[PDB]
Design a protein around this ligand. Sequence first.
Ligand SMILES: c1ncc2c(n1)NCC2
Length: 165
Amino acid sequence: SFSGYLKLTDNVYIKNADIVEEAKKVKPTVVVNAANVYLKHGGGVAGALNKATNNAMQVESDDYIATNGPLKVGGSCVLSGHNLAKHCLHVVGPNVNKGEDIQLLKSAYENFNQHEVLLAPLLSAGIFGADPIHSLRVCVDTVRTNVYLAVFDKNLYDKLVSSFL
Ligand SMILES: c1ncc2c(n1)NCC2
């Protein structure tokens, strides 16, 4: 089970941890991937989760895209969690670096409400370019199910906790 998390609200928890390492340890029912519409897991959380699956996540994702086409920004799909989780919920937050509507971040977090408990990163944070403090605020104000947030960067984790309202 999840350990060492700081409780932020009734249902949101946070820990300074590598989501890949957290997933291998806990083997949650759902690990959230910070996906793009093409499910091209090149970098950030997606690249790290995919590399941990020995590229099996990318092979499965390419078959999903070949069949279904790309996801919408703000959308998601449930695929296998491979050696990391029972399932991976690939969620597409807006990539601010690609000029995408930051208002789609709430729509992206709404996908989490379809799962009772999730291990997740902050959507649109990191290489997606959004303000992680804003992402945490949207997470707490949108997600009603139990979300265990893994924040890789210690300095960002401290900033998120110390500024949390
Ligand atoms: C949480 N947030 C970001 C990352 C992570 N976990 N693993 C590597 C990049």
